[PDB]
């Protein structure tokens, strides 16, 4: 928990205040552009269900992955920035992203 982006944002967003979460992905796009993926390419989710959608374009994403030396309370993350297609599972009305399935 020492000032790279992942350590800072995992703490701020309440993911690592009470545990170290092994992996998390942050999407640097507007909320409505990420919500727009729920009407883009329909694909199967990893679990087999079919309410997943893949973005037509790549999006700016930061992957945060715990190091092999990370132990609560001192969570530590390797930060990887990339531009990738995101795959989200969608539910509700309005039909909105509720789970991040993958980036490709």
């Amino acid at each position: 928990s020492s000032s790279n982006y992942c350590n800072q944002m995992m703490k701020s967003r309440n993911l690592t205040k009470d545990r170290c979460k092994p992996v998390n992905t942050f999407v640097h796009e507007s909320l409505a552009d990420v919500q727009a993926v729920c009407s883009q390419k329909n694909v199967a989710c990893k679990n087999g269900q079919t309410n997943c959608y893949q973005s037509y374009s790549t999006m700016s994403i930061t992957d945060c992955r715990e190091t092999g030396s990370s132990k609560y309370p001192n969570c530590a993350y390797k930060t990887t920035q990339a531009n990738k297609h995101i795959i989200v599972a969608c539910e509700g009305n309005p039909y909105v992203p509720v789970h991040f399935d993958a980036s490709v």
């Binding site: 944002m9 967003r13 309440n14 993911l15 998390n24 992905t25 942050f26 999407v27 640097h28 796009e29 507007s30 909320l31 990420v34 930061t62 989200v88 539910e91 509700g92 909105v96 992203p97 509720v98 789970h99 991040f100």
Partner: peptide, 15 residues
Amino acid sequence: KETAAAKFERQHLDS
């Protein structure tokens, strides 16, 4: 409390 859609935004969006 927090809906599933709200949790997705808190955990994964950084606009």
